[PDB]
Amino acid sequence: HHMQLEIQVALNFIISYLYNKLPRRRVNIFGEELERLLKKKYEGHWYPEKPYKGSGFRCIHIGEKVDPVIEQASKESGLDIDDVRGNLPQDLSVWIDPFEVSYQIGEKGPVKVLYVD
Ligand SMILES: O=c1[nH]c2ccccc2n2cccc12
C-alpha cells in the first residue's frame, strides 16, 4: 500500500534465504528491523514522479561489502553478519523503486523482477 508494500516485497525475498539456516524468531526480528531501517532511510528519497531519482541510494547491495542497513539489521537481531552474508546469494543487488522491485545475483547476472505495477 505504498513504498511500504515494496519494502515488504524486498524483505520477504531477502529473509527467505535466511529461514531454515538461521533461527526463526530472530530472522523475524531481522526482517522487522530491516523494514524499519529502509523506511527510515528512504524517507524523503521517494519520488513516484521520477522513480529513478535516488535509485542508487535506495539500492541494497551485498557484494564484498555489506550495506549498513543489512549490517544494522544483523546486529539488532543478534545475528553474526557473516552468517547472514553466508546464507544470502553473493553479489546481490536489490533496487527498490516506485512501481518496481528487482534484483541481480552475480556481477554478470540478469536483473530479475519481483514486483512491478
Ligand atoms: O550496484 C548498484 N546498482 C544500481 C542500480 C540502479 C541505480 C543505481 C545503482 N547503484 C549505485 C551505486 C551502486 C549501484
Residue numbers in the entry: -1 to 115
Tell me what the authors wrote about this structure, in their words:
The anti-proliferative protein Tob belongs to the Tob/BTG family and plays important roles in cell proliferation, embryonic development, cellular differentiation, cancer suppression, and apoptosis. The anti-proliferative mechanism of Tob was revealed by its complex structure complex with CNOT7 (Caf1), and was further shown to be dependent on CNOT7 or CNOT8 but independent of other CCR4-NOT complex subunits. Two conserved regions of Tob, termed Box A and Box B, mediate the largely hydrophobic interaction with CNOT7 and are conserved in other family members, including BTG2. TobN138 consists of five α-helices and four β-strands that form two anti-parallel β-sheets.
We employed a fragment screening approach to discover inhibitors of the Tob-CNOT7 interaction. To provide structural insight into fragment binding, crystals of human Tob residues 1–138 (termed TobN138 hereafter), containing Box A and B motifs, were soaked with a buffer containing several fragments. Structures of TobN138 with two inhibitors, corresponding to compounds 1 (i1) and 6 (i6), were determined to 2.3 Å resolution. In the TobN138-i1 complex, i1 π-stacks against Trp93 and is coordinated by the side-chain of Ser53. Superimposing the Tob-i1 complex onto the Tob-CNOT7 complex structure shows that i1 overlaps with Ser201 and Cys202 on helix α10 of CNOT7. Trp93 is highly conserved among the Tob/BTG family and is located in the Box B motif. Asp95 and Glu98 of Tob form a salt bridge with Lys203 in CNOT7, while Trp93 inserts into a hydrophobic pocket on the CNOT7 surface. The first shows 96.4% inhibition and binds to a strictly conserved site located on Box B in the CNOT7 interface, including residues Trp93 and Asp95. Missense mutations W93A and D95A abolish the interaction between Tob and CNOT7 in vitro and in vivo. Our results indicate that Box B of Tob should be targeted for efficient inhibition of the Tob-CNOT7 interaction.
